């Protein structure tokens, strides 16, 4: 019997090869077991252009309403994509837009498969990055200086007090300038979520900044975290034999590499983007990773596939040929979506299905049935072969489907 | 008989554990075998405070004059350091101030010992990071927003063109803002350095940015590198079977961790700081890495230890507790300083001494005498033990001192 879900799930469609596997996953794994009401938004690049990127804002507003989104990987366009898709604007990142509106922390962690070898031998336990999802480089204003001139910052107070101007630089010739920001509210919510997840895991927490160089900007991150820790969380950290410490970013990453894992890592928005990929790759593969935005309100989430759209595999699919594409991150976006939908509704049957599918995915890879990229981690890309070391995208999903049916019975 | 050194070498002194190691090296390893005139500048935090940070500017000026600096790792103040040292102001990064005056690229690579298992087993060849030494976070203007108000950017052209304003954010409550920049001239020189270094090494080059998010700012880096590649280097890269590619920083770092090395990695100022510590640590230790600021003119350099002051080892050493800090990167700052001084003057004995001291360091570790960090790579950090697997800071330095005297004795 299919599990009845009462409240809706927001579904965000994607691009190229991820768009196609997103549909297979829905057909083969999700819908045959779950009767769920889907609130569809096409964040494919053609439709984002068609709606002047308004579909992206509505998908986020819908997520605030219904409290659970699941997202397919999308194209953030450059010059090349603007020419290829004939876009009228170089539209901003859908991910950055959705994260800004919703706010909160993007938690990312590996999907550990026993047989997929780590590139960092020392990491015996997993690590979780809490990436702050708001502000900084993902809400910056930047520009090209094409001639001599003065660049300055200006802060005009609301209360009526005098404006403060800072002369940033008197450009003699061309260059670039940018401004970015963040709020106390956004940093406080970011801190709270990280402290709570650390208690939940029984793991210590590390904040990373460069407050020696950005003494006001990064110092505020250090100050707010240490304030919230002292007043709200120090007692709960002591009871669980865990701690909190601020580290300089360059010191942190070395320490992380030397570690054995088993900690939470609060990263700034930019650092989260960079270091989550070092984490994913170090644990075995970029495709073996979850990514879940947890909003400040505690109720709303957005689960996503954090990787790209796999353009090379898509081109082959256009020419009627078979591909071998890892669907696990996309699968885990659905399960994390459905699990939280089940938590809010009090639907234990749904929660159990999501966890069962996550386990079946790992077991299928651990049994030796896998896609080309994962088989390449084991035997090397030069030594792998079809129906010997790896399977087609749909065949792997069909293997996952068979194992999912056996587990449920 | 000391080696006479005709011309001076600028010396920048530092803080905490590196300051103590710096003085051992100067006193006991360098000037008993090298008659060298040192233009001494104390960039220890108390003297920077004493001089209103002018000594930092004066050290940078002196490096331009004599073309060679050797620097000890320094403290950059935050709020805690103002309390600690009772500072007049929250002074800026002296490395920032030095790098901004001198300009150039900071080249960073591992110091390889056959004896030391990597944390990243895949990296069978070394990797060099060309770090851009100018602009971005290290020249930024940042501030605390402590009341409601609007933050904007304003560009006013010098020759009468229309001025442009951009609203960054309307703050309802408290927060933070910042503005930063870089220049076409600085980024072009950064490209030239990295392309030239790549052709020397016969290695491919990668530039990392986030041009998909920072369309203008990071796009400018991508465009200038590509123009300069096609105008000056593309032919030579193709002839030498090497290549240049741009990659998104997040894509790049994953590629690095999975690679087997053998490439140059052009990093922006911020990225180069973070990624150079990943690199040193992955090859074995923060103590086994060189760092050289190569200026545009092709003559001036500043050699340093990439790693910090080792504050956590300094707190133990202050209270008399056991300590084992790796001095090799700090020694290699002296040797690359002297080697370059020797190369400029045509002083062959001074070049040989520098290289002899580098061989002594590597052969000392390769013979089984080492500091804790390196012992941990072999035996595991949770099983190493004082005087069984590793030596003290002083006992390891005395071992370098003993082996050095024996080396040039032979
Ligand atoms: Mg990323
Ligand atoms: Mg550093």
Author numbering:
A (entry chain A): 42 to 450
B (entry chain B): 42 to 451
Give verbatim lines from the article.
The isocitrate dehydrogenases (IDHs) compose a family of enzymes that catalyze the sequential dehydrogenation and decarboxylation of isocitrate to α-ketoglutarate (αKG) in the mitochondria or the cytosol. Hence, IDH2 plays an important role in reactive oxygen species (ROS) removal in the mitochondria or the prevention of age-related diseases. We have previously shown that under calorie restriction (CR), mitochondrial deacetylase Sirt3 deacetylates and activates IDH2 in mouse cochlea. In this CR-mediated pathway, we have shown that mIDH2 activity was regulated by its acetylation/deacetylation state.
